[PDB]
């Protein structure tokens, strides 16, 4: 599986994936499905964030590629793929600037129009059980939730969707491509089996 | 009282035995990490000195 996940994803995402998995002392060889899960999470967050910039107002204007100008402002500061210390220092900076609320668990991004955090998730199991798991995990929450599925159906709170439908279609295309190359590789089910194992990692000395 | 040649007679193999007894019914990784030090002391070498 390592060969495929090293080939398809660009080096920035696989780099951040070893970065994040190593942060906790997990071994890429004894735990291999986790590396692919992390790579998919990183890629989907980056895709959800990229191709979005802000104007003087809100209602993000979309571009094929960013234009060279003073509009350097980016719509989403990607908290994911960051060190824990810097992740919580960016979170604290945001909370001290906008006076927002401090979450109990690490969010994944922050949006300024609705002025709050967002927690993207990716799951093998279909939506309406992982969603309620994440919801009853993140208690007393304002962070919007936006979970995807490899099949192609998503869900969220307040039926709220924070961006265009073409970007969602792009995410869904990427996930279906991955899924129906897994079907060819036979890896898919291997990933499926270990979701429960994902919750926690056991020390191995 | 006092003990003559206290350190000379304190074998690291009995420290390994004591560590193995103390760490009974525990995750094997913890037993190994705590056992490693007596293992290194049992095979330890001493530099002779300046000359």
């Amino acid at each position: 599986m390592e060969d495929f996940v090293r080939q398809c994803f660009n080096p920035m995402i696989v780099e951040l994936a070893e970065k994040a998995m190593k942060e906790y002392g997990e071994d890429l060889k004894i735990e291999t499905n986790k590396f692919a899960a992390i790579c998919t999470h990183l890629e989907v967050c980056f895709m959800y964030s990229d191709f979005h910039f802000i104007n003087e107002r809100g209602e993000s204007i979309i571009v094929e590629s960013g234009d060279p100008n003073a509009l350097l402002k980016h719509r989403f500061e990607i908290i994911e793929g960051r060190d824990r210390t810097m992740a919580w220092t960016v979170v604290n900076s945001i909370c001290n600037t906008t006076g927002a609320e401090k979450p109990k668990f690490l969010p994944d991004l922050y949006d300024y129009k609705e002025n709050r955090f967002i927690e993207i998730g990716v799951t093998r199991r279909e939506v309406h059980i992982y969603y309620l798991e994440k919801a009853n995990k993140i208690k007393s929450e304002k962070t919007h939730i936006h979970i995807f599925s490899f099949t192609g159906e998503e869900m969220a709170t307040k039926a709220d969707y924070t961006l265009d439908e073409e970007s969602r279609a792009r995410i869904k295309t990427r996930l279906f491509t991955i899924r129906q190359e897994m079907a060819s590789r036979g890896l898919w089910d291997s990933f499926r089996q270990s979701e429960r194992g994902e919750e926690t990692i056991e020390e191995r000395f | 009282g006092d003990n003559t040649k206290w350190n000379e007679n304190q074998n690291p193999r009995m420290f390994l035995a004591m560590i193995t007894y103390i760490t009974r019914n525990q995750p094997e990784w913890f037993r190994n990490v705590l056992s490693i030090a007596p293992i290194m002391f049992s095979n330890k070498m001493a530099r002779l000195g300046k000359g």
Binding site: A70, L72, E77, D83, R84, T85, M86, V90, I94, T97 | -
Partner: protein, 49 residues
């Protein structure tokens, strides 16, 4: 300090966040924010090379 991020990566990212938050509400106006972001991009490029 604790973390796993390299010296230059942490320093440049922290400075980037500081420039962003200062531009949104602080002393930094567009000129200094742009200069800081450009210099940080130069640092990142020099790091990768």
């Amino acid at each position: 300090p604790v973390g796993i991020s390299s010296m230059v990566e942490a320093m440049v990212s922290r400075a980037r966040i500081d420039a962003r938050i200062d531009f949104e509400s602080g002393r930094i106006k567009k000129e200094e924010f742009a200069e800081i972001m450009k210099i940080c991009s130069t640092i990142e490029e020099l790091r990768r090379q």
